[PDB]
């Protein structure tokens, strides 16, 4: 296990050194995209249930 560990640390230092982070412009762009992605999926499964539920007994209408 000694030989693999040295290689892993050596690779890691180079990779961190490489880039830094999502370089400000990127940081906003990816973060917003994830939020939109969550919302679109979230919206549509959620919408169907509104119609389905008050058929048996009216609780909010649909």
């Amino acid at each position: 296990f000694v030989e693999p560990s040295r290689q892993f640390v050596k690779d890691s230092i180079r990779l961190v050194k490489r880039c830094t982070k999502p370089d400000r412009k990127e940081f906003q762009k990816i973060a917003m995209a994830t939020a939109i992605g969550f919302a679109i999926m979230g919206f549509i499964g959620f919408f169907v249930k509104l119609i389905h539920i008050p058929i048996n007994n009216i609780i909010v209408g649909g």
Partner: protein, 452 residues
Amino acid sequence: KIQFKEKVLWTAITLFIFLVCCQIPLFGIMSSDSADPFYWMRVILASNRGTLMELGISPIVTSGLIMQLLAGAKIIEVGDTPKDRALFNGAQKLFGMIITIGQSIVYVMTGMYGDPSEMGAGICLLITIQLFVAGLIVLLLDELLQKGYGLGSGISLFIATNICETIVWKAFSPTTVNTGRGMEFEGAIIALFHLLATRTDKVRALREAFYRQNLPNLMNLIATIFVFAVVIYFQGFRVDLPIKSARYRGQYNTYPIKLFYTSNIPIILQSALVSNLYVISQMLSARFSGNLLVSLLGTWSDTSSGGPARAYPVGGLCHYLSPPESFGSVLEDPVHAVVYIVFMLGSCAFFSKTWIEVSGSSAKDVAKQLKEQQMVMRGHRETSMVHELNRYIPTAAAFGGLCIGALSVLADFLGAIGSGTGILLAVTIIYQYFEIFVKEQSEVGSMGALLF
């Protein structure tokens, strides 16, 4: 015909089957056992699929466990047999697809055993056909996704959809709540702000320890936040080295690496698969075969039990590779915490290396593509143009996956979701698909392509 419109339709049919699936697969009610087991098992399975019980989409990824394990074992012994084992990586994946229908199907049922099977009556009939149809349609489309039909987003996309969908349902269901806020919006008691707001406005802040009151709901939100900050940091990071690109002659494009990121997909996959393997085998051993001592048959067959929790075996390797059943609110066991981090990490790294071989990205595959467009021969080097990217592909791949499997175990500890599996694997997929969707599409944008 080739045409982006045809590809989107093939995805749309698969997606439609998933939506269709959301009704059907369950058995719904009557009696029997089809309905879904415990903590890990659901994530793979995907969504709400017959209300509370999610039966449908489990087998495809289950076959993928078989793919990984053997390939890295890399059998040499017995002459005719190693060639079969090498071929197995693809050939087994089809055999595995047969095994999951054959043998996984009992495992899929067993956890929510409702009341005993063999109860009988004519009742079900349509249910007997619908399960049979489900086996026919999902298995046929799964074959078609591995060898010609898709678009961007096949198998991963159902997991991607599932997490967002799961969060709203857990948020908007019955459980313990005094009284609704008097606006139930589009269904029950939606986003957590409404749940907090019940009587008057506010009162979240009052509680014990500045957590207790609304802590199960709070814990779910923080889980997402912890992942949110770290996930973007490494997705942004890039490895350069394209150098001299474009044949020489001047006009050029920098080429982003696949590298560490391509190896990342097997580790995220690993956390899901590894947990599966121990539970199916643990279930098999008791059912198949009698049992002196618990330990004698196997470790992880050690103390097979219904235990304190859904997490069946209270001892053995499987126990360690499940949460302590408090999601890091007790970590002063030790033996459990130590094993969980280390065991997953070494298994993941092993699987990162098997992705290189003939199942994913290696330097040789890249090299031939580069010649066609003429990439500058990776600045020559002679025996180079192959040594450049080649030496740096195992080092990047092994490292690339390595971090994440530790981080996944720590994510449970920091403040897991209530399911404690289902959001966690799934979120990692949700980011991933956005990258696949548009960069592969080549139609330079990021805009529509839903049905275009």
